[PDB]
Design an enzyme around this catalytic site. Structure first.
Site, PDB file in Angstrom:
ATOM      1  N   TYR A 158      29.512  49.482  32.388  1.00 49.61           N
ATOM      2  CA  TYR A 158      28.669  50.230  33.307  1.00 49.61           C
ATOM      3  C   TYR A 158      28.048  49.262  34.302  1.00 49.61           C
ATOM      4  O   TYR A 158      27.901  48.069  34.028  1.00 49.61           O
ATOM      5  CB  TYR A 158      27.575  51.001  32.565  1.00 49.61           C
ATOM      6  CG  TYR A 158      26.500  50.102  32.017  1.00 49.61           C
ATOM      7  CD1 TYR A 158      26.759  49.256  30.954  1.00 49.61           C
ATOM      8  CD2 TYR A 158      25.233  50.084  32.572  1.00 49.61           C
ATOM      9  CE1 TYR A 158      25.790  48.431  30.454  1.00 49.61           C
ATOM     10  CE2 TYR A 158      24.256  49.256  32.074  1.00 49.61           C
ATOM     11  CZ  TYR A 158      24.539  48.431  31.016  1.00 49.61           C
ATOM     12  OH  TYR A 158      23.566  47.602  30.514  1.00 49.61           O
TER      13      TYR A 158
ATOM     14  N   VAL B 133      28.498  43.905  38.512  1.00 47.77           N
ATOM     15  CA  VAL B 133      28.008  42.546  38.297  1.00 47.77           C
ATOM     16  C   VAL B 133      28.294  41.703  39.534  1.00 47.77           C
ATOM     17  O   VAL B 133      29.438  41.636  40.003  1.00 47.77           O
ATOM     18  CB  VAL B 133      28.643  41.920  37.045  1.00 47.77           C
ATOM     19  CG1 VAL B 133      28.086  40.530  36.811  1.00 47.77           C
ATOM     20  CG2 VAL B 133      28.400  42.803  35.835  1.00 47.77           C
TER      21      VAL B 133
ATOM     22  N   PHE C 100      25.084  32.428  34.129  1.00 48.72           N
ATOM     23  CA  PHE C 100      26.356  32.393  34.834  1.00 48.72           C
ATOM     24  C   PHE C 100      27.402  31.639  34.027  1.00 48.72           C
ATOM     25  O   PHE C 100      27.181  30.494  33.621  1.00 48.72           O
ATOM     26  CB  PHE C 100      26.197  31.750  36.210  1.00 48.72           C
ATOM     27  CG  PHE C 100      27.422  31.861  37.068  1.00 48.72           C
ATOM     28  CD1 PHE C 100      27.812  33.082  37.585  1.00 48.72           C
ATOM     29  CD2 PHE C 100      28.189  30.746  37.350  1.00 48.72           C
ATOM     30  CE1 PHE C 100      28.939  33.188  38.367  1.00 48.72           C
ATOM     31  CE2 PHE C 100      29.317  30.848  38.135  1.00 48.72           C
ATOM     32  CZ  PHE C 100      29.692  32.071  38.643  1.00 48.72           C
TER      33      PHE C 100
ATOM     34  N   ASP D 270      36.463  33.992  32.496  1.00 49.55           N
ATOM     35  CA  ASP D 270      36.694  34.719  31.261  1.00 49.55           C
ATOM     36  C   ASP D 270      37.932  34.158  30.571  1.00 49.55           C
ATOM     37  O   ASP D 270      38.681  33.362  31.142  1.00 49.55           O
ATOM     38  CB  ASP D 270      36.756  36.240  31.529  1.00 49.55           C
ATOM     39  CG  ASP D 270      38.165  36.781  31.834  1.00 49.55           C
ATOM     40  OD1 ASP D 270      39.182  36.063  31.806  1.00 49.55           O
ATOM     41  OD2 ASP D 270      38.238  37.977  32.184  1.00 49.55           O
TER      42      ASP D 270
ATOM     43  N   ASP E  82      33.530  45.616  21.244  1.00 53.61           N
ATOM     44  CA  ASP E  82      34.205  45.495  22.532  1.00 53.61           C
ATOM     45  C   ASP E  82      34.753  44.089  22.720  1.00 53.61           C
ATOM     46  O   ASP E  82      34.628  43.494  23.795  1.00 53.61           O
ATOM     47  CB  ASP E  82      33.274  45.874  23.682  1.00 53.61           C
ATOM     48  CG  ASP E  82      34.017  46.480  24.854  1.00 53.61           C
ATOM     49  OD1 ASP E  82      35.179  46.901  24.666  1.00 53.61           O
ATOM     50  OD2 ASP E  82      33.444  46.537  25.962  1.00 53.61           O
TER      51      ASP E  82
ATOM     52  N   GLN F 266      38.483  40.111  28.437  1.00 55.51           N
ATOM     53  CA  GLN F 266      37.597  40.227  29.586  1.00 55.51           C
ATOM     54  C   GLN F 266      36.148  39.909  29.247  1.00 55.51           C
ATOM     55  O   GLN F 266      35.411  39.454  30.126  1.00 55.51           O
ATOM     56  CB  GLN F 266      37.655  41.636  30.173  1.00 55.51           C
ATOM     57  CG  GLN F 266      38.737  41.860  31.204  1.00 55.51           C
ATOM     58  CD  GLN F 266      39.945  42.550  30.621  1.00 55.51           C
ATOM     59  OE1 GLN F 266      40.197  42.474  29.419  1.00 55.51           O
ATOM     60  NE2 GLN F 266      40.690  43.251  31.466  1.00 55.51           N
TER      61      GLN F 266
ATOM     62  N   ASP G 152      28.975  41.633  27.536  1.00 59.64           N
ATOM     63  CA  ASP G 152      29.174  43.075  27.680  1.00 59.64           C
ATOM     64  C   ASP G 152      28.904  43.813  26.367  1.00 59.64           C
ATOM     65  O   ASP G 152      29.797  44.398  25.751  1.00 59.64           O
ATOM     66  CB  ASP G 152      30.578  43.381  28.206  1.00 59.64           C
ATOM     67  CG  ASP G 152      30.583  44.495  29.230  1.00 59.64           C
ATOM     68  OD1 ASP G 152      29.608  45.275  29.263  1.00 59.64           O
ATOM     69  OD2 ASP G 152      31.560  44.591  30.000  1.00 59.64           O
TER      70      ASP G 152
HETATM   71  C1  LIG Z   1      32.346  34.040  37.543  1.00 58.64           C
HETATM   72  C2  LIG Z   1      33.115  34.962  36.635  1.00 58.64           C
HETATM   73  C3  LIG Z   1      34.446  35.267  36.896  1.00 58.64           C
HETATM   74  C4  LIG Z   1      35.150  36.103  36.064  1.00 58.64           C
HETATM   75  S1  LIG Z   1      36.846  36.478  36.411  1.00 58.64           S
HETATM   76  O1  LIG Z   1      37.235  35.762  37.595  1.00 58.64           O
HETATM   77  O2  LIG Z   1      37.615  36.285  35.211  1.00 58.64           O
HETATM   78  C5  LIG Z   1      36.805  38.203  36.784  1.00 58.64           C
HETATM   79  C6  LIG Z   1      36.620  38.440  38.285  1.00 58.64           C
HETATM   80  C7  LIG Z   1      37.828  39.403  38.260  1.00 58.64           C
HETATM   81  C8  LIG Z   1      37.447  40.885  38.283  1.00 58.64           C
HETATM   82  C9  LIG Z   1      38.643  41.682  38.759  1.00 58.64           C
HETATM   83  N1  LIG Z   1      38.940  41.408  40.164  1.00 58.64           N
HETATM   84  C10 LIG Z   1      40.349  41.648  40.465  1.00 58.64           C
HETATM   85  C11 LIG Z   1      40.591  42.558  41.643  1.00 58.64           C
HETATM   86  C12 LIG Z   1      41.880  43.328  41.443  1.00 58.64           C
HETATM   87  C13 LIG Z   1      42.012  44.414  42.489  1.00 58.64           C
HETATM   88  N2  LIG Z   1      40.990  45.425  42.255  1.00 58.64           N
HETATM   89  C14 LIG Z   1      41.318  46.727  42.556  1.00 58.64           C
HETATM   90  C15 LIG Z   1      40.582  47.817  42.089  1.00 58.64           C
HETATM   91  C16 LIG Z   1      40.949  49.111  42.375  1.00 58.64           C
HETATM   92  C17 LIG Z   1      42.094  49.326  43.133  1.00 58.64           C
HETATM   93  C18 LIG Z   1      42.853  48.238  43.598  1.00 58.64           C
HETATM   94  C19 LIG Z   1      42.466  46.943  43.304  1.00 58.64           C
HETATM   95  F1  LIG Z   1      43.179  45.883  43.736  1.00 58.64           F
HETATM   96  N3  LIG Z   1      43.920  48.748  44.312  1.00 58.64           N
HETATM   97  C20 LIG Z   1      44.958  47.980  44.963  1.00 58.64           C
HETATM   98  C21 LIG Z   1      43.852  50.118  44.301  1.00 58.64           C
HETATM   99  O3  LIG Z   1      44.633  50.884  44.838  1.00 58.64           O
HETATM  100  N4  LIG Z   1      42.728  50.474  43.586  1.00 58.64           N
HETATM  101  C22 LIG Z   1      42.327  51.866  43.365  1.00 58.64           C
HETATM  102  C23 LIG Z   1      40.818  52.019  43.230  1.00 58.64           C
HETATM  103  C24 LIG Z   1      40.408  53.402  42.759  1.00 58.64           C
HETATM  104  C25 LIG Z   1      41.206  53.910  41.604  1.00 58.64           C
HETATM  105  O4  LIG Z   1      40.779  54.730  40.811  1.00 58.64           O
HETATM  106  N5  LIG Z   1      42.481  53.416  41.449  1.00 58.64           N
HETATM  107  C26 LIG Z   1      43.052  52.389  42.156  1.00 58.64           C
HETATM  108  O5  LIG Z   1      44.119  51.931  41.807  1.00 58.64           O
HETATM  109  C27 LIG Z   1      39.755  44.963  41.621  1.00 58.64           C
HETATM  110  C28 LIG Z   1      39.455  43.514  41.971  1.00 58.64           C
HETATM  111  C29 LIG Z   1      38.547  40.043  40.504  1.00 58.64           C
HETATM  112  C30 LIG Z   1      38.853  39.109  39.356  1.00 58.64           C
HETATM  113  C31 LIG Z   1      38.188  38.855  36.860  1.00 58.64           C
HETATM  114  C32 LIG Z   1      34.540  36.662  34.952  1.00 58.64           C
HETATM  115  C33 LIG Z   1      33.230  36.369  34.680  1.00 58.64           C
HETATM  116  C34 LIG Z   1      32.508  35.522  35.513  1.00 58.64           C
HETATM  117  N6  LIG Z   1      31.161  35.198  35.255  1.00 58.64           N
HETATM  118  C35 LIG Z   1      30.202  35.878  34.583  1.00 58.64           C
HETATM  119  N7  LIG Z   1      29.045  35.231  34.371  1.00 58.64           N
HETATM  120  C36 LIG Z   1      28.098  35.870  33.729  1.00 58.64           C
HETATM  121  C37 LIG Z   1      28.262  37.172  33.272  1.00 58.64           C
HETATM  122  C38 LIG Z   1      27.289  37.924  32.573  1.00 58.64           C
HETATM  123  C39 LIG Z   1      27.550  39.181  32.174  1.00 58.64           C
HETATM  124  C40 LIG Z   1      28.815  39.783  32.451  1.00 58.64           C
HETATM  125  O6  LIG Z   1      29.071  40.934  32.094  1.00 58.64           O
HETATM  126  N8  LIG Z   1      29.776  39.053  33.141  1.00 58.64           N
HETATM  127  C41 LIG Z   1      31.095  39.636  33.435  1.00 58.64           C
HETATM  128  C42 LIG Z   1      31.086  40.963  34.191  1.00 58.64           C
HETATM  129  C43 LIG Z   1      32.463  41.548  33.948  1.00 58.64           C
HETATM  130  C44 LIG Z   1      32.995  40.922  32.709  1.00 58.64           C
HETATM  131  C45 LIG Z   1      31.929  39.974  32.198  1.00 58.64           C
HETATM  132  C46 LIG Z   1      29.509  37.761  33.547  1.00 58.64           C
HETATM  133  N9  LIG Z   1      30.472  37.127  34.197  1.00 58.64           N
END
Ligand code: A1A1I
Ligand code: ZN
EC number: 2.7.11.22
Lengths: 382, 298, 276, 822
Positions: free
Chosen positions: B15, B18, B82, B86, B127, B131, B145
């Site tokens: 939910y 971030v 931070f 992942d 969970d 990821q 998470d």
């Molecule tokens: C620093 C750090 C880095 C990473 S990482 O890099 O690993 C990560 C970044 C990442 C997240 C995913 N995107 C990838 C992209 C892919 C394309 N896209 C997308 C989406 C929909 C699309 C689409 C797309 F292309 N297209 C072509 C479509 O048509 N649609 C439609 C849409 C509608 C639909 O319905 N249908 C569709 O299809 C989404 C983005 C970036 C890469 C992976 C991880 C963690 C961190 N740090 C950090 N620190 C502290 C905390 C504290 C708490 C906490 O919770 N977290 C995290 C939060 C989440 C997990 C934990 C923390 N995290």
């Protein structure tokens, strides 16, 4: 089955963000008036009047043009490009912004906008502005409302019993097959003066065609009541048109239909003639049929959504699809339908991106799985 | 909220959204989870309340720290610490040569300590997916998470049925078991341990029956001898195909004997005899543990 | 001292779980003089509100844990406020329960249902507002060991056969409802807050058990609970004279879970006899 | 295309009738409007004397007589359908009679949509104003002052947007309108007062009353009764403010009362009629006689007899009633007091011919005495017949008592093939029972189709007792005795649509080919039909070949020894093989439903109701149909016809006719593919069937059409020089001829539609040109003054007003001669 999804969210476009301005303004144009209107160059959508078009704009001149077009009017020309995709646009639609938002945050402009189509035009000239902006000099096509087919041949002594009492509640016994049988026998009593029977004139009756279309529109996501599907045949035809999964060349011909009667006849034509939605560039796989089509939003089975990269997808929602494999794992990021996660779907033969498979992620959600198939990779058939 | 400055979107958890932001006061990088309560009809969502409540009671080197919570009108912000990546993106970036065996050892050893800390506090993560396991450049892996977490009671009672992602769902949960407990998380860790070595998902199913059949194909069809009560489980049918315990020497090649034993214990069918996190930390596999530093370009 | 009531554990080790439980008991402070900060209020309407919440739980088949979570939330939220009128009290009460709902049971009743229960005195927006300020005032420390959770623990340590097996419920369903019925009767009066929740559950367990079962199950000793037992006397008595109820059945709930649902029959009628 | 349109027969269907003192202050007059002609009769003991007949530039939609204060005669108010109104006065000067236009004006609004219920015109009893209901939501008042010679009018807002009917009440100091309307929860009746000095609506003298759900007729009862009478499907009610009196007789339940008349000035009894053509008398008995007032006591109604389906009724004093019909011959009957000859009190004593709704005609001629016979299918329901028009004008009627749809002529068999439809009711015991004996049931020989290929057996849906079914027959009628020699009934739920009589291929037999469509009440579009080939040989009618098709055969035609038919939206060319069978040869698929389909040479012209007209060609040595041209604009189309290889003529909405051309310029393979429209004209009639043939023998070609209102018209083609000459003459006649109501000819003949209006081009009005011989010599000398006749070579300028007489008189004898009224 049952759907406790509260189908308003897909129309709300909540994935686009929170703090979105909500212009209540409206504007029109005189019929057959030559207007000069700006054009978005990257949208390839064939916009139908009454359709919601979300857009995400990155390019600097595009930010600038939306920013300066917000105040003076709010209309831009979405040209309906023909099969020849580069230029060669002969007709199109005007779209007026009803939601606009600007975030300098993250150090990038990005303009998030939601517009809706109002008019249709023919483009007589296409000039180019100083900074890669297309200005279309266009003439507004007319909405030709046609009078009733008995307005000419009519006995003025029988023109007094031509109002009919009322609608017979809603879908009861002796209330659909009986009321319409007496409606056809009283509205077309002067058909005995002409050379054609009553059932021929029923084929060109706006009320009858709208009811016949609603009979099928109920099979896809049973309707609450006539709150949607406006009574005006023009609005009803434009709304039904946005839901048909037909391809682009058929959509152009449908958009050229001037009268609402012919538009309803053509929509009702491609509602039972079509049998199967198949892979477009692959041409062999049977993806889905009509029977699994259902609407998850008030707009109907099909609506326009936008991915984070700005591309606009017409996603038809179906219950079941075949010849598709999933690539990757479910993600809830930027999901068009809140509470569902998407997985990229490609066809088994040509590995062409056809759509996504949405699965339930929260608690107590009725449709546990469905498929959203993009229209650009579907070719309706026999 | 006027002190933090957003820099980039990270992603979406169970939910909220971030972001990465730097505090203008002390100049440290943090993450900010944002919730829009105005859209949420049921006020603050249940997952938000659960995760916030549990996260202020769990303070471990291997659990993501909840620094501060604020409320600015119609928005809820949680400040986290931070982490640079992942586990999933690190595994994908190392799909050719791969994570060293000592690095996998250290990652699994550090996840087990956090899981044992949660289980000692009667907390079910539920969970555990790649990821949600976040790694940094210093070589530490942490759990994140907690939105799907729940504090299980003593005794336990029936909770939410379909939980955990499909690829990491335990067989008892698939079979509709009445009572589930800590073991599920252990299963996920096993499903992740084998994922760190074979480099693809151990059980990649797109449906419940699929997943269950793949689990059977890899580990054999369970009976009353190895798992008392399968024949009485609500979702068990006598028509299940009979597969025979595919040898772990082929399922998970690149690891040695003690690792094979530990993984087999982590993937035991019955929850009662499935290895606990603490008794897994006593395994001989964790006899020469180190803390290597991953090099994670991108 | 609390030596080690709980047996040897497999999914964790017993000492850590135990000291964590005791430190959780220590961390959540509760004051029996939290009403003196509000001169307008009296214990009687606190009892009335708690009974009304009991009825609300009984209507929606909410678990006993939900009710006692709401009770702890209320008793800790009033202690951090000053000079509140009784008119607000109902709202606060429902808000606590509302929060407790999201924390415990699988399918919360919706917000409109909670508003409808208040009979128009409280609205959904008001409920959300009061829940948010409640979550602030408790510093989001919303995971206490309730009076009924301790009772579950004690009941499991009471009936154990093949060692371990502390997570799978195994105990009779009528002793538990009797002890809980005593506990909610003791929950309406304010001074119950004087004694720890674990000590409360232990003494209420003893009032329907022996002096050795309590000590084997709870880890406590006679002196630390002499005051609790002496104070509880009336309650246990009035209940013994009235006669214990039976394990009633609920629609949509398995027969092995009905004892974990709040059952309100009558409390205020017995409290006045208790206070006499 | 340089066309020339004239009328060979004036409209015969009467659309309005009124009685009053028009000619003089004491004689009784009957005024009948049919489409555009107003006929004035002086009613006498002998009958009707036709004193006058005038023609107006417009379709009379509303007409009433009214005598304002200080007037000796009755003035006439006429509003035509182009929304222009005129107040006219009869005067006679010794021996010349003309209709003075006392007032005239245009009444239409710039913005507004015509009402669904239609134009309603009412006139203040004592004549303080004229009320018009034209558009929804507003009611417009014309004050009848002595200075409103331009008919200035003002609109009062009507809150009720669905007004069923409205009338002016009697005995009110301020004028009152009582109207029945509908709101989305019922059907109500309520009154209003009109204030002229302040121009609004005041509260009426009654209360808003909830009335019968099918109430459709408000009539105003005069003094001493007052009030109003509401007539609907179920009951007749009387409201007079406080007093209410309703009766629900079972005698009027069979049909819907549509027309009414007041036969007593006191209002004691009325005359009314229904759709089925039976006549009732509504009796109002005073029988109260209070201290100083008279009120109603009961409202009984009684049957009087049967008449022609009546569109209007009028009482002409001394028992005589004129019944004006649009579906059949008009009648002039007499109501006896105690006749009861068999139960009917009416006896017919005069019949006026009425060509009616000409749905299809044929031209029959072998010898060239007058080289013409026009056999037309006229009428509907009980009074459907066929009319034979000869020039010797002799109109001979053959009644069928069933509706005739299509007619075709076979020379070899000396017979007519007529498609007929009969209405039957569903019996309780199961089966169809007939209303009256029709020509289908009284044929010399009879046959029923025994086709078994239509097993169907898919939801037969046995209907309910009382349902109306439509059986279709083919009748072989003799051409000398006009006796039905054979009737062939088609299958159940089979609508016969097309009929051709032609030779097919290499056999010498001539056939009757009919196309059918199986129509079911649930299936909106038919998905099955037949093409049946019959032979009428020495008495019998044998089915030679039957062919299944997957749709309705709307129209078909013989084409170079083959057939070509329209099955839904495909055009299929069948070749009649050697073994008496019909085999398909060519197929074309269109985006429009091929309703109208006419061929000439190797060209085929198809079209639908939506005016989208397509033009294909048959390529002999390739074997299919090639699309040559097509112009598609939305408008309702009634009939189409191909004049020559290039020009195609059709009839479209608002009673217009158009001609579209082909080719020309031919610039870039798209100009030739565009069917550019060339000519427009406002006929004023809904033309229904459009065929070839000459009916009497500088105009090349003769194409004649038959319309709904009974008119028969002829359109020919002229040349450049003659079109220019007569178009110049047309403008010169418009400045010398004055119409009734001061209606401009250009405005009246302008192409009209409620989205656009343009002047008529490419068409020459034959009536106006032929009215050149009815003008006087000194007036004739102004038309031809500065002209340039030109013939031999020189323009001879003057034209002497005797040369154009020769030209117009030569143009006159290309059609029949109109009989003089009197
Ligand atoms: C620093 C750090 C880095 C990473 S990482 O890099 O690993 C990560 C970044 C990442 C997240 C995913 N995107 C990838 C992209 C892919 C394309 N896209 C997308 C989406 C929909 C699309 C689409 C797309 F292309 N297209 C072509 C479509 O048509 N649609 C439609 C849409 C509608 C639909 O319905 N249908 C569709 O299809 C989404 C983005 C970036 C890469 C992976 C991880 C963690 C961190 N740090 C950090 N620190 C502290 C905390 C504290 C708490 C906490 O919770 N977290 C995290 C939060 C989440 C997990 C934990 C923390 N995290
Ligand atoms: Zn493919």
């Amino acid at each position: 089955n049952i759907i406790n999804f509260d189908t308003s969210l897909p129309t709300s476009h909540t994935y686009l963000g929170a703090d979105m301005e909500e212009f209540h303004g409206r504007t029109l144009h005189d019929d057959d008036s030559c207007q000069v209107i700006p054009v978005l160059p990257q949208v390839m959508m064939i916009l139908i009047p009454g359709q919601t078009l979300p857009l995400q704009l990155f390019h600097p001149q595009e930010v600038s043009m939306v920013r300066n077009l917000i105040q003076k009017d709010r209309t831009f020309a979405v040209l309906a490009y023909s099969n020849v995709q580069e230029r060669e646009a002969q007709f199109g639609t005007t779209a007026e912004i009803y939601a606009y938002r600007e975030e300098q945050d993250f150090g990038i402009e990005i303009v998030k906008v939601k517009a809706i189509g109002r008019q249709r035009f023919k483009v007589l000239e296409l000039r180019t502005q100083s900074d890669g902006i297309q200005q279309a000099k266009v003439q507004i096509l007319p909405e030709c409302v046609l009078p009733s087919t008995m307005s000419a041949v009519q006995l003025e002594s029988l023109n007094k019993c031509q109002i009919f009492p009322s609608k017979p509640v809603s879908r009861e016994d002796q209330c659909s097959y009986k009321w319409w049988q007496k409606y056809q026998k009283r509205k077309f009593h002067c058909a005995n003066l002409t050379s054609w029977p009553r059932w021929l004139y029923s084929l060109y009756d706006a009320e009858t065609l709208m009811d016949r279309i609603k009979k099928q529109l109920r099979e896809w996501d049973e309707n609450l009541k006539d709150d949607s599907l406006p009574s005006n045949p023009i609005d009803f035809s434009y709304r039904v048109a946005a839901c048909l999964p037909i391809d682009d060349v058929l959509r152009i011909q449908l958009l050229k239909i001037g009268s609402a009667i012919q538009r309803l006849r053509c929509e009702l034509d491609i509602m039972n003639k079509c049998t199967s939605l198949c892979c477009k560039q692959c041409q062999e796989t049977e993806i889905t049929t009509k029977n699994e089509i259902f609407s998850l939003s008030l707009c109907g089975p099909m609506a326009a959504y936008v991915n984070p990269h700005g591309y606009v997808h017409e996603t038809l929602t179906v219950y079941k699809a075949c010849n598709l494999n999933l690539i990757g794992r479910p993600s809830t990021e930027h999901s068009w339908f809140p509470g569902y996660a998407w997985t990229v779907a490609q066809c088994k033969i040509c590995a062409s991106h056809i759509g996504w498979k949405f699965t339930a992620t929260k608690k107590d959600m009725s449709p546990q799985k469905f498929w959203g198939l993009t229209r650009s990779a579907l070719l309706p058939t026999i | 909220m006027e002190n933090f400055q957003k820099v980039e979107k990270i992603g979406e958890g169970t939910y909220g959204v971030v972001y990465k932001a730097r505090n203008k006061l002390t100049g440290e990088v943090v993450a900010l989870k944002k919730i829009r309560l105005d859209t949420e009809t049921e006020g603050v969502p249940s997952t938000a309340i659960r995760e916030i409540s549990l996260l202020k009671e769990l303070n471990h080197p291997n659990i993501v720290k909840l620094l501060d919570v604020i409320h600015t009108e119609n928005k809820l912000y949680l400040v986290f610490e931070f982490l640079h990546q992942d586990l999933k993106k690190f595994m994908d970036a190392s799909a050719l040569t791969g994570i060293p065996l000592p690095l996998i050892k250290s990652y699994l050893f550090q996840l087990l300590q956090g899981l044992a800390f949660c289980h000692s506090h009667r907390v079910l993560h539920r969970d555990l997916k790649p990821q949600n396991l976040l790694i940094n450049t210093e070589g530490a892996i942490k759990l994140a998470d907690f939105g799907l977490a729940r504090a299980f009671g003593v005794p336990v009672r029936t909770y939410t049925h379909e939980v955990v992602t499909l690829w990491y769902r335990a067989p008892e949960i698939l079979l509709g078991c009445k009572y589930y407990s800590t073991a599920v998380d252990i299963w996920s860790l096993g499903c992740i341990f084998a994922e760190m070595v074979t480099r693809r998902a151990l059980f990649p199913g797109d449906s419940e029956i699929d997943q269950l059949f793949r689990i059977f194909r890899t580990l054999g069809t369970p009976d009353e001898v190895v798992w008392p009560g399968v024949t009485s489980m609500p979702d068990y049918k006598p028509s299940f195909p009979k597969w025979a315990r595919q040898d772990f020497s082929k399922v998970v090649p690149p690891l040695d004997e003690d690792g094979r034993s530990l993984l087999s214990q982590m993937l035991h069918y019955d929850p009662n005899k499935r290895i606990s996190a603490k008794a897994a930390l006593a395994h001989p596999f964790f006899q020469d543990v180190t803390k290597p530093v991953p090099h994670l370009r991108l | 001292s609390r030596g080690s009531p709980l047996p040897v554990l497999s999914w964790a080790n017993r000492e850590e779980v135990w000291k964590i439980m005791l430190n959780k008991e220590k961390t959540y402070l509760r004051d029996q003089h939290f009403l003196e900060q509000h001169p307008l209020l009296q214990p009687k309407m606190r009892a009335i509100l708690l009974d009304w919440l009991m009825e609300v739980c009984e209507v929606y088949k909410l678990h006993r844990e939900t009710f006692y979570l709401a009770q702890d939330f209320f008793d800790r939220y009033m202690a951090t406020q000053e000079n509140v009128v009784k008119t607000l009290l109902q709202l606060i009460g429902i808000s606590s329960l509302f929060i407790a709902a999201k924390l415990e049971e699988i399918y919360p009743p919706k917000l409109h249902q909670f508003a409808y229960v208040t009979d128009g005195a409280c609205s959904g927006d008001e409920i959300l507002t009061m829940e948010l300020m409640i979550m602030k005032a408790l510093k989001w420390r919303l995971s206490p060991l309730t009076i009924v959770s301790w009772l579950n623990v004690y009941m499991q340590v009471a009936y154990l056969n093949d060692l371990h097996e502390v997570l799978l419920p195994q105990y009779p369903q009528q002793i538990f409802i009797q002890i809980a019925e005593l506990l909610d009767l003791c929950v309406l009066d304010v001074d119950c807050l004087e004694f720890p929740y674990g000590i409360l559950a232990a003494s209420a367990l003893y009032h329907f058990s022996s002096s050795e079962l309590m000590q084997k199950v709870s880890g406590y000793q006679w002196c630390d609970i002499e005051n609790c037992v002496k104070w509880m006397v009336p309650f246990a008595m009035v209940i013994r004279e009235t006669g214990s109820s039976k394990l009633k059945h609920f629609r949509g709930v398995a027969d092995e879970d009905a004892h974990n649902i709040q059952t309100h029959r009558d409390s205020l009628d017995l409290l006045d006899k208790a206070r006499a | 295309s340089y066309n020339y349109v004239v009328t060979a027969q004036k409209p015969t269907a009467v659309n309005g009738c009124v009685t009053g003192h028009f000619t003089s202050a004491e004689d009784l007059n009957l005024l009948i409007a049919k489409n555009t002609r107003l006929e004035i009769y002086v009613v006498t003991a002998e009958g009707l004397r036709p004193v006058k007949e005038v023609g107006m530039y417009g379709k009379i939609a509303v007409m009433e007589l009214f005598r304002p204060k200080g007037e000796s005669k009755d003035l006439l108010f006429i509003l035509t359908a182009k929304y222009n109104a005129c107040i006219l006065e009869y005067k006679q000067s010794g021996e010349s009679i003309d209709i003075i236009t006392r007032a005239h004006g245009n009444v239409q609004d710039r913005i507004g949509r015509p009402s669904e219920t239609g134009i309603i015109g009412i006139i203040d009893p004592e004549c303080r104003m004229i009320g018009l209901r034209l558009y929804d939501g507003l009611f417009k008042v014309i004050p009848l002052d002595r200075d409103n010679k331009e008919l200035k009018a003002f609109n009062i807002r009507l809150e009720e947007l669905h007004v069923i009917d409205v009338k002016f009440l009697y005995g009110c100091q301020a004028p009152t309108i009582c109207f029945v309307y509908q709101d989305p929860q019922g059907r109500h009746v309520k009154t209003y007062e009109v204030s002229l000095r302040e121009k609004e609506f005041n509260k009426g003298p009654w209360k808003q009353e909830n009335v019968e759900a099918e109430a459709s007729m408000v009539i105003a009862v005069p003094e001493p009764f007052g009030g109003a009478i509401i007539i609907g499907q179920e009951s007749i009610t009387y409201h007079n403010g406080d007093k209410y009196l309703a009766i629900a007789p079972p005698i009027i339940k069979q049909s819907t009362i549509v027309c009414h008349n007041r036969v007593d000035p006191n209002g004691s009894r009325y005359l009314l009629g229904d759709m089925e053509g039976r006549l009732f008398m509504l009796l109002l008995e005073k029988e109260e006689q209070m201290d100083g007032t008279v009120t109603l006591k009961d409202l009984r109604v009684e049957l009087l007899g049967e008449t022609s389906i009546a569109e209007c009724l009028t009482y002409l004093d001394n028992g005589v009633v004129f019944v004006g019909s649009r579906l059949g011959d008009s009648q002039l009957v007499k109501l006896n007091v105690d006749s009861n000859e068999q139960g009917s009190y009416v006896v017919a004593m005069e019949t006026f011919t009425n060509l009616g709704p000409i749905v299809d005609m044929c031209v029959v001629d072998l010898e060239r005495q007058g080289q013409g016979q026009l056999v037309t299918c006229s009428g509907a329901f009980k009074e459907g017949s066929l009319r034979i028009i000869r020039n010797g004008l002799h109109i001979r009627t053959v009644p069928l008592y069933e509706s005739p749809r299509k007619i075709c002529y076979q020379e070899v068999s000396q017979c007519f093939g007529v498609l007929s439809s009969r209405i039957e009711v569903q019996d309780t015991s199961g089966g169809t029972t007939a209303l009256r004996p029709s020509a289908s049931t009284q044929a010399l020989s009879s046959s029923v189709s025994s086709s078994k290929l239509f097993s169907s057996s898919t939801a037969p849906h046995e209907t309910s007792f009382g349902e109306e079914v439509e059986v279709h027959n083919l009748l072989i009628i003799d051409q000398h005795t006009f006796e039905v020699l054979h009737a062939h009934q088609f299958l159940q739920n089979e609508y016969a649509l097309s009929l051709v009589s032609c030779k097919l291929g290499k056999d010498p037999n001539t056939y009757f080919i009919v196309g059918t469509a199986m129509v079911y009440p649930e299936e909106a579009e038919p998905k099955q039909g037949r093409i049946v080939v019959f032979q009428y040989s020495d008495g019998k009618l044998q089915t030679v070949a039957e062919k299944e098709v997957k749709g309705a055969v709307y129209s078909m035609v013989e084409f170079n020894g083959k057939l070509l038919a329209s099955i839904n939206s495909t055009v299929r060319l069948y070749e009649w093989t050697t073994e008496k069978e019909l085999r398909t040869e060519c197929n074309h698929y269109n985006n429009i439903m091929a309703l109208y389909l006419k061929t000439k040479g190797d060209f085929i012209l198809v079209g639908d109701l939506m005016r989208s007209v397509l033009l294909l060609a048959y390529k002999p040595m390739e074997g299919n149909f090639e699309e040559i041209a097509r112009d598609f604009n939305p408008n309702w189309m009634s009939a189409v016809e191909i004049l020559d290889d290039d020009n195609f003529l059709g009839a479209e909405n608002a009673f217009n006719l158009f001609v579209c051309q082909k080719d020309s310029a031919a610039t870039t393979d798209e100009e030739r593919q565009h069917l550019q429209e060339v000519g427009l004209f406002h006929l004023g009639e809904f033309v229904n069937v459009f065929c070839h043939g000459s009916l009497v023998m500088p105009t090349q070609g003769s194409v004649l059409f038959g319309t709904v209102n009974g008119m028969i018209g002829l359109v020919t083609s002229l040349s450049e020089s003659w079109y220019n000459l007569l178009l110049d003459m047309q403008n010169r006649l418009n400045k010398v001829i004055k119409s009734v109501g001061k209606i401009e000819h250009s405005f009246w003949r302008s192409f009209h539609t409620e989205r656009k209006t343009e002047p008529a081009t490419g068409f020459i009005d034959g009536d106006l040109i032929e009215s050149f011989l009815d003008i006087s010599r000194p007036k004739m000398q102004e038309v031809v003054a500065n002209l340039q006749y030109d013939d031999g070579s020189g323009m001879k300028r003057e034209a002497t007003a005797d040369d154009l007489i020769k030209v117009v008189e030569e143009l006159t004898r290309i059609h029949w001669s109109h009989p003089q009224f009197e």
